[PDB]
Design a protein around this ligand. Structure first.
Ligand SMILES: *[C@@H]1O[C@H](CO)[C@@H](O)[C@H](O)[C@H]1NC(C)=O
Ligand SMILES: *[C@@H]1O[C@H](CO)[C@@H](O)[C@H](O)[C@H]1NC(C)=O
Ligand SMILES: *[C@@H]1O[C@H](CO)[C@@H](O)[C@H](O)[C@H]1NC(C)=O
Ligand SMILES: *[C@@H]1O[C@H](CO)[C@@H](O)[C@H](O)[C@H]1NC(C)=O
Ligand SMILES: [Cl-]
Ligand SMILES: [Cl-]
Ligand SMILES: [Cl-]
Ligand SMILES: [Cl-]
Ligand SMILES: [Cl-]
Ligand SMILES: [Cl-]
Ligand SMILES: [Cl-]
Ligand SMILES: [Cl-]
Ligand SMILES: [Cl-]
Lengths: 294, 294
């Protein structure tokens, strides 16, 4: 399994305790980091994934997980962690852009409030299957499957902040962070054996008055397994439902105060996922992973 | 009064019968243009503004009005008309872009479905007050009031088609057609002595399930005059309402089958304009001009 389903590894809870597996420095313990803000005293109760360990975390909503190295005359107290297993489904990686010809050869925009979703959405409208974000404000679309052409980069090189949301990475100069344009669409058809479906506008907070239906139709499936590796909802009014495709009967309903079980199975090959959002509130959103069985 | 409230002078009904007032050629009569498609036989009943005259018209939904010149070995049967009075409120003109520094110095996009409204909307989101369209696909934002810096051009130089809608002009290479970003917004506050308010997404067809309120609040006005120099609605379900700001009482309601009077007055300084749109249909839209009185 991948270990983060957020854009910035907010949700990373794994056990990496080096800034990098290769060439890295080791993390300080969050229960000894009292010279800094971020430690188990400020965050008892396990807030932020912090606790009696030295694992990489991101409790300051930065653009990626990190930890405190301990300064070596460098002047550098902390570093971002480069965690290859922490890469949200739909994030295709960080690649080098050497200019002409660029990696994605569709159509572009630049934006003072650019975010990942904003880039994805522009690209999606345009009928392109990939979106690419650079230098915090630039956005590129394209159907090129050879975006990887000029070589992959370490994800820490794609850490320039999104101009629109300082909690999201938007690539780096010469560096472009690539996303599948399906991520966060309001509805869809799905047929794959398994895939992930995120809230509308993920990783941005889901817009107001959203109403989305996603059909998951897997002919030949005897039953389908659902799990929620992410689930943030603020309001009881905001809802996620599962509907029998044939009957439209409501199999399950999950809201701010109803919390999705570990997993559940549905005895159907045809299910609809339904999401209704309150105007008044928006929250982090969710991610649901479905696995079909033959 | 300005003589067109559309982007392409579809609605021009004035009496210009030269391709241009200065240096131009004269128009053929639409009731003699039988060697061409466009004539009073194909269009009896005055369709398209065509009839027993030689006035500039645009019945083929091209990007601007035109007429048939009559060929002079040129090989050229028709030309666009350059009509200075036919310039929809909000269209700020056609200007020269000489590259660095460009006329609008905000932020830009390029788009395979670019239209005027699309450009306006991008710019509007970004908090810029002007949008500029070039070469049919390019879109530029900015707050520069000196966009006119490199000189104005004849509107016929901004006639490259919008990639997204072949009925709209999207500038020309080296040429940029400028719009106020208020045009077609879904709602607003208005205070001016008078101004024009267009359908949502004008000049594109109004999106589905639109619900818009515009407040027109002119303190000191004894009463306010309303007229509709444009009104296309396909469905009875699609509606425009006027509401007493103080009471929210419905002063007037206009829909596909209810047709706005010449003018009407309201004995108030505070009125709300309300627009509800059916999912099923979208139409050309409307333009309403209000004049406050002291
Ligand atoms: C913090 O917890 C770590 C890991 O369990 C432990 O090794 C260390 O001694 C603890 N230090 C304090 C001050 O609790
Ligand atoms: C990383 O994880 C655990 C403690 O949480 C421990 O076994 C291991 O020694 C840690 N690595 C380092 C370098 O401290
Ligand atoms: C067409 O109408 C014009 C303008 O009224 C007139 O001058 C002309 O003789 C008419 N021609 C025909 C064929 O009706
Ligand atoms: C333009 O308009 C009217 C006829 O519709 C006429 O008075 C005038 O002569 C026309 N001009 C030309 C050049 O035909
Ligand atoms: Cl710090
Ligand atoms: Cl504290
Ligand atoms: Cl490099
Ligand atoms: Cl956009
Ligand atoms: Cl449905
Ligand atoms: Cl023709
Ligand atoms: Cl015919
Ligand atoms: Cl020039
Ligand atoms: Cl209201």
């Amino acid at each position: 399994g991948p270990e983060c389903f957020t854009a910035n590894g907010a949700d990373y809870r794994g056990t990496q305790n080096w800034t990098a597996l290769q060439g890295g420095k080791p993390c300080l313990f969050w229960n000894e980091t009292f010279q800094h803000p971020y430690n188990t005293l400020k965050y008892p109760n396990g807030e932020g994934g912090l606790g009696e360990h030295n694992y990489c975390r991101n409790p300051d909503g930065d653009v990626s997980p990190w930890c405190y190295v301990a300064e070596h005359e460098d002047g550098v107290y902390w570093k971002y962690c480069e965690i290859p297993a922490c890469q949200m489904p739909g994030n295709l990686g960080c690649y080098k852009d050497h200019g002409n010809p660029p990696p994605l050869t569709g159509t572009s925009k630049t934006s003072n409030k650019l975010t990942i979703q904003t880039c994805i959405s522009f690209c999606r409208s345009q009928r392109f299957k990939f979106a690419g974000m650079e230098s915090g404000y630039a956005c590129f679309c394209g159907n090129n499957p050879d975006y990887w052409k000029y070589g992959e980069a370490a994800s820490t090189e794609c850490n320039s902040v999104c101009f629109g949301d300082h909690t999201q990475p938007c690539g780096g100069d010469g560096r472009i962070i690539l996303f599948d344009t399906l991520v966060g669409a309001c509805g869809g058809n799905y047929s794959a054996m398994s895939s992930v479906v995120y809230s509308p506008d993920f990783p941005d907070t889901y817009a107001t008055g959203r109403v989305c239906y996603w059909t998951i139709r897997v002919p030949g499936a005897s039953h389908i397994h659902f799990s929620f590796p992410l689930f943030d909802i603020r309001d009881s009014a905001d809802m996620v439902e599962l509907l029998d495709g044939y009957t439209h009967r409501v199999l399950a309903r999950f809201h701010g105060r109803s919390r999705p079980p570990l997993s559940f199975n549905v005895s159907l090959d045809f299910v609809i996922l339904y999401f209704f959002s309150d105007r008044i509130n928006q929250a982090q959103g969710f991610a649901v992973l479905y696995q079909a069985v033959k």
